[PDB]
Design a protein around this ligand. Structure first.
Ligand SMILES: Nc1nc2c(ncn2[C@@H]2O[C@H](COP(=O)(O)OP(=O)(O)O)[C@@H](O)[C@H]2O)c(=O)[nH]1
Ligand SMILES: Nc1nc2c(ncn2[C@@H]2O[C@H](COP(=O)(O)OP(=O)(O)O)[C@@H](O)[C@H]2O)c(=O)[nH]1
Ligand SMILES: [Mg+2]
Ligand SMILES: [Mg+2]
Lengths: 176, 179
């Protein structure tokens, strides 16, 4: 290969991220890195004098936090592009993305991962509840291409990914 | 056979001393666990890209897993919490700046639902590695009107004291909020 290009799928649960990548790729097996996180409690019986109360302390703790940090770090490591995903049938999924993309830190021209905004499930027109001219707006406001895609159909899937490949490669040329 | 069930949480970066602290304090081995797996993964697609000149691009697309189950485990963690044992490691300035940042983005509830907090500088038993200045921590404590204990989980110093204090604030908030 010439270049190895890392991309991330980003978006809320249920938005179709995993179905998206299956559609585009389609490749029997793929590697997973996985770990156990959790919570637990303990108890202690104690007496508190206000008067003289019988109190049950149940104390909680997290487990696996560092192991999960590493995973998130490995995920973001060296990412060149974001497949930025909301649900074309969920106005909440679209609002969350907007909120997220406004608490985004600016970067120098070259460190700045390219972003392509994606409205998924365009093959469920009946359940649609997201204004497509309102989507265009968020795209335009950040100079970001937008696409309406179907992980079902295949509609725009290849084209979205490739459009982001373009951005990355142009940018790479500009920073060599 | 009890009057009140009072839920507390140990918060803080990893390695700070939380799990130890708790065991030090309860001195019993009852400890149910709710554990879930999360992960990440990638896929591959070979693509030809031309600017003109032709480049063989190896595409690798990553994805996460278990986000939603992780969310709701964290929601379960915070649900009906009444007091945070807010902890940092006196030997790790970074552990303390994380606590302070965290404090700065708590959203205060209504008085009666607002969780009580105690700030804890754990690992007081290792003075030769102390990196978090005393006055700095006390100022955080006060910025929030919070008590502050330097504790050793290894040693039991102030562990008893800290929890008791936290409980006492919780109980006070209750007598005021009754009826
Ligand atoms: N009809 C249709 N259903 C979809 C599409 N993408 C995802 N889904 C469904 O929506 C649900 C959530 O999908 P998923 O890929 O797991 O979203 P994720 O949390 O972002 O990984 C699943 O039941 C999918 O079958 C699509 O493009 N068309
Ligand atoms: N010297 C010292 N070491 C401690 C203390 N508390 C915890 N440790 C050690 O720090 C390491 C991480 O502690 P741990 O309880 O797992 O912290 P956690 O990640 O918050 O659960 C362990 O090897 C503990 O023995 C303390 O008060 N003093
Ligand atoms: Mg998924
Ligand atoms: Mg622990």
């Amino acid at each position: 290969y010439d270049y190895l290009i890392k991309l991330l799928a980003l978006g809320d649960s249920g938005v179709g991220k995993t179905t998206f990548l299956y559609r585009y790729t389609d490749n029997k097996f793929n590697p997973k890195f996985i770990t156990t996180v959790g919570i637990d409690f303990r108890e202690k019986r104690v007496v508190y004098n206000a008067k003289a109360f019988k109190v049950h302390l149940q104390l909680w703790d997290t487990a696996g936090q560092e192991r999960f940090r590493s995973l998130t770090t490995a995920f973001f490591r060296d990412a060149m592009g974001f497949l930025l995903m909301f649900d074309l049938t969920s106005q909440q999924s679209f609002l969350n993305v907007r909120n997220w993309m406004s608490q985004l830190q600016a970067n120098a021209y070259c460190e700045n991962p390219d972003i392509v905004l994606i409205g998924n499930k365009a093959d469920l027109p009946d359940q649609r509840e997201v204004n497509e001219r309102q989507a265009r707006e968020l795209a335009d406001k950040y100079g970001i291409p937008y696409f309406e895609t179907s992980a079902a159909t295949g509609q725009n899937v290849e084209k979205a990914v490739e459009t982001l490949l373009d951005l990355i490669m142009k940018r790479m040329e500009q920073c060599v």
